Design a protein around this ligand. Structure first.
Ligand SMILES: NC(=O)C1=CN([C@@H]2O[C@H](COP(=O)(O)OP(=O)(O)OC[C@H]3O[C@@H](n4cnc5c(N)ncnc54)[C@H](OP(=O)(O)O)[C@@H]3O)[C@@H](O)[C@H]2O)C=CC1
Ligand SMILES: NC(=O)C1=CN([C@@H]2O[C@H](COP(=O)(O)OP(=O)(O)OC[C@H]3O[C@@H](n4cnc5c(N)ncnc54)[C@H](OP(=O)(O)O)[C@@H]3O)[C@@H](O)[C@H]2O)C=CC1
Ligand SMILES: Nc1nc(N)c(/C=C/C2CC2)c(-c2ccc(C(F)(F)F)cc2)n1
Ligand SMILES: Nc1nc(N)c(/C=C/C2CC2)c(-c2ccc(C(F)(F)F)cc2)n1
Ligand SMILES: [Co+2]
Ligand SMILES: [Co+2]
Lengths: 159, 159
């Protein structure tokens, strides 16, 4: 099982300026629940976005994709291809835009948090992947984050 | 990864008289999508409940759990303990009531369809397992089947 997990604005923006223009504790808790115990695969830029204090994310096999053969990610594995990272029963691809696109052919689940923020797309933004017809999606109810933004979860799935 | 998948009335009834006392085509398509490609494990009574013309379920490794040492299920593997049945990247336990109770301590996910049908629990009924607070899951909310019944999906997980 390869899954993708991401949060996006309604416009599809998932990152900007190397970070994320919102922060929902409730979604972070859902992210921890879904990924705990499993492999997490992330691009190098997303690894760079994690403060050294918090990485590797605990209780998970942290894997970083990089084309730099000598890149060092203390507490993680750095691999040069996505296929190397797929040696567990569950692998969660946790970003960013480039790695979601690369991992989509391998995936059977996308856990997508939609953030009710009106965020027009900018040059340089990282964007969520386009999901074609093969994906089956249950659209959850709008929830109120304590941050003030509404959000809802889509659990997309395909065989 | 061991998951349980079932559809229940709100009361918890999943089976009666060797049958499922409703029809929900959207749930069947959902069950097909989640189980396709994977191992499916079922108790002998559930295997018996499938007409020979529609078993084994296509595209899945069908496994039947029975205490009869040399029971034959043409088109499936027969095992005498759930543990022999599991061997998986991904196994879905597909019923019925006895096998769900046996399998729950090994499960990390339950995919539950709840059918809004006023079905009282009756002596002899097959019942769904009742899930702890340790099973964290969203809560679907009510959808309308072309069968005319109302239904919703729960995706339970525990870390
Ligand atoms: N909203 C959300 O849910 C999430 C948002 N984000 C955001 O996403 C943004 C970063 O995403 P993005 O900019 O797309 O960068 P990524 O995080 O996708 O990392 C891109 C890097 O991954 C490596 N890489 C990419 N493709 C390959 C390949 N085929 N083979 C080997 N290595 C590869 C390269 O590393 P190198 O350059 O070292 O070779 C590349 O520079 C940030 O803003 C971040 O905050 C991230 C995760 C979740
Ligand atoms: N709504 C739904 O999602 C579903 C509903 N159903 C319904 O459920 C009902 C059947 O459920 P149920 O009556 O509980 O029967 P099960 O389908 O759970 O089969 C029970 C049988 O499995 C075998 N078995 C049970 N425990 C063990 C064990 N520990 N070791 C080895 N073998 C074991 C025995 O077979 P033997 O007697 O051969 O030893 C036992 O008779 C039917 O009405 C069916 O339609 C079924 C699946 C899904
Ligand atoms: N829903 C959802 N998914 C995600 N992958 C993420 C971020 C993951 C990481 C590591 C930077 C978040 C926040 N939230
Ligand atoms: N959600 C959920 N879980 C399940 N384990 C099952 C079925 C298990 C098995 C093998 C008999 C279903 C399901 C599928 C098809 C039908 C219908 F063919 F009768 F229409 C009814 C119910 N649905
Ligand atoms: Co699957
Ligand atoms: Co898990």
């Amino acid at each position: 099982m390869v899954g993708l997990i991401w949060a996006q604005a309604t416009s599809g923006v998932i990152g900007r300026g190397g970070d994320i223009p919102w922060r929902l504790p409730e979604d972070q808790a859902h992210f921890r629940e879904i990924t705990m115990g499993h492999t997490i695969v992330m691009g190098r830029r997303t690894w760079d976005s994690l403060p050294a204090k918090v990485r590797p994310l605990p209780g998970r096999r942290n894997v970083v994709l990089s084309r730099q053969a000598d890149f060092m990610a203390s507490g993680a594995e750095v691999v040069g291809s996505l296929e190397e990272a797929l040696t567990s029963p569950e692998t969660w691809v946790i970003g960013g835009g480039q790695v979601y696109a690369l991992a989509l052919p391998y995936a059977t689940r996308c856990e997508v948090t939609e953030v009710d923020i009106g965020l027009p797309r900018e040059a340089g933004d990282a964007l969520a992947p386009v999901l074609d017809e093969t994906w089956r999606g249950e659209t959850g109810e709008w929830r109120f984050s304590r941050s003030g933004l509404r959000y809802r979860l889509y659990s997309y799935h395909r065989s």
